[PDB]
Design a protein around this ligand. Structure first.
Ligand SMILES: O=C(Nc1ccccc1)Nc1ccccc1
Length: 319
C-alpha cells in the first residue's frame, strides 16, 4: 500500500510515492542515476513501520515526473528546491533527507542550501566532498586526461551518450546493475582509449544479480524505454554550472546529524573519496562501508541499509 500522487513543486510536477501517515516525522527519499522511486521499494515499508512519513518522488527528468528539454533546468538549485516543495506541499517545516547516488549529492547540497529545513541528512554511495578549486571537468581531465575514456566526461556532449543508452535500454539496465564493478581487469578496459561507449565498455553478466529479479529489472527497462535517459544525463551536464552556483558555500558546513554509507566495492569512491567528509559534515557524522557491497546498495543490502537508516533516525529531533 505505498501510494502515488502527482505533486506540483518548484514550477514542475513530480510523481510521488509515499507511505505512512501525514503528521508523522518526514523522511524524504531521493533516488539516483539511472533509477527511480522504485529503487526505495525495500526501504519504504521499513521506514513506515519505524514510525515515519515517507516520500519517494521520481525526480525531475525521471519516471512519471516532468522532463524539461532544457539542461539548465537540471542544475543543483532546481533539484534541491524540487524536494523542499514536497515539504511545503503538506506544511512540513523540516525533514530527514536520504539520498543514494545523484540523490545523495542533491541531499548534501540540500543540507547546505536549506539548513533550516534539514533535520538530518544521509547520503548513500556518494560522500561529502569539499568544493574543488577547479571546475569538475577540469579536475577530471587532470585526473584522466583527454585520450583515456571516462564516463562523466563522455556524458557531457548532449546527444551522444543519450543515443548509446537509449539504443538498447535492456542492455543498459542489465549491464548497469550487473556490470558495475571495481575489478581491475574491467577498470583498465573501461579506461582505454577508443570510440567505444560506456555501456559497450561494461561487462554483460550471464545471470541476474542475486538481489534483483526479472520483474524488477523489467520495470526499470520499461520506464526508461518510455522516458529515455536524457533526463538523468542532464544532471551530469550541470556539474560545472553547479560548481559556479555554489561558490558562496566554500566555508559552509553541515552541522546537521549526518550519515554516509557505501558498498565498500563501489566504483565511484575511487574519484569520490570519502576521506574529507568531516571537512563538510561537521556535526554528528558516521561512515558505514559494507564489505563486498558495490554500487546499488539499498537494493543489494536492504536489511542492512534499513537497519542503518532506522538506527540513524532513532532519537533525532526531526519535527
Ligand atoms: O555517476 C554516479 N554518481 C555521481 C553523481 C554525481 C557526480 C559524480 C558521480 N553514479 C553512477 C551510477 C551508475 C553508473 C555510473 C555512475
Amino acid at each position: 500500500t505505498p501510494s502515488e500522487r502527482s505533486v506540483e513543486t518548484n514550477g514542475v510536477r513530480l510523481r510521488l510515492v509515499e507511505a505512512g501517515e501525514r503528521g508523522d516525522p518526514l523522511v524524504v527519499l531521493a533516488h539516483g542515476f539511472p533509477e527511480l522511486a522504485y529503487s526505495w521499494r525495500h526501504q519504504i515499508p521499513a521506514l513506515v513501520d519505524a514510525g515515519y512519513h515517507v516520500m519517494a518522488p521520481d525526480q525531475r527528468g525521471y519516471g512519471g515526473s516532468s522532463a524539461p528539454e532544457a539542461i539548465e533546468a537540471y542544475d543543483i538549485t532546481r533539484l534541491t528546491a524540487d524536494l523542499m516543495g514536497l515539504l511545503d506541499d503538506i506544511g512540513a517545516e523540516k525533514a530527514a533527507f536520504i539520498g543514494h547516488d545523484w540523490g545523495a549529492l542533491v541531499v548534501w547540497n540540500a543540507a547546505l542550501l536549506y539548513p533550516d529545513r534539514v533535520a538530518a541528512v544521509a547520503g548513500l554511495s556518494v560522500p561529502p566532498v569539499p568544493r574543488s578549486l577547479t571546475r569538475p571537468t577540469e579536475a577530471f581531465r587532470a585526473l584522466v586526461g583527454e585520450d583515456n575514456f571516462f564516463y562523466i566526461l563522455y556524458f557531457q556532449e548532449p546527444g551522444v551518450a543519450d543515443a548509446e543508452l537509449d539504443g538498447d535500454p535492456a542492455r543498459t539496465m542489465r549491464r548497469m546493475f550487473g556490470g558495475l564493478t571495481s575489478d581491475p581487469d574491467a577498470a583498465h578496459r573501461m579506461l582505454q582509449p577508443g570510440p567505444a561507449g560506456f555501456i559497450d565498455r561494461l561487462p554483460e553478466p550471464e545471470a541476474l544479480p542475486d538481489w534483483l529479479t526479472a520483474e524488477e529489472l523489467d520495470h526499470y527497462i520499461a520506464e526508461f524505454t518510455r522516458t529515455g535517459f536524457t533526463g538523468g544525463l542532464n544532471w551530469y551536464r550541470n556539474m560545472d554550472r553547479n560548481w559556479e552556483l555554489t561558490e558562496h558555500l566554500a566555508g559552509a558546513t553541515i552541522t546537521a546529524p549526518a550519515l554516509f554509507l557505501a558498498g565498500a566495492a563501489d566504483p565511484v569512491l575511487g574519484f569520490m573519496r570519502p576521506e574529507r567528509a568531516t571537512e563538510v559534515a561537521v556535526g554528528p557524522y558516521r561512515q558505514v562501508l559494507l564489505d563486498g557491497a558495490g554500487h546499488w546498495v539499498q537494493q543489494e543490502r536492504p536489511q542492512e541499509v534499513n537497519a542503518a537508516l532506522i538506527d540513524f533516525l532513532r532519537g533525532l529531533e526531526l519535527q
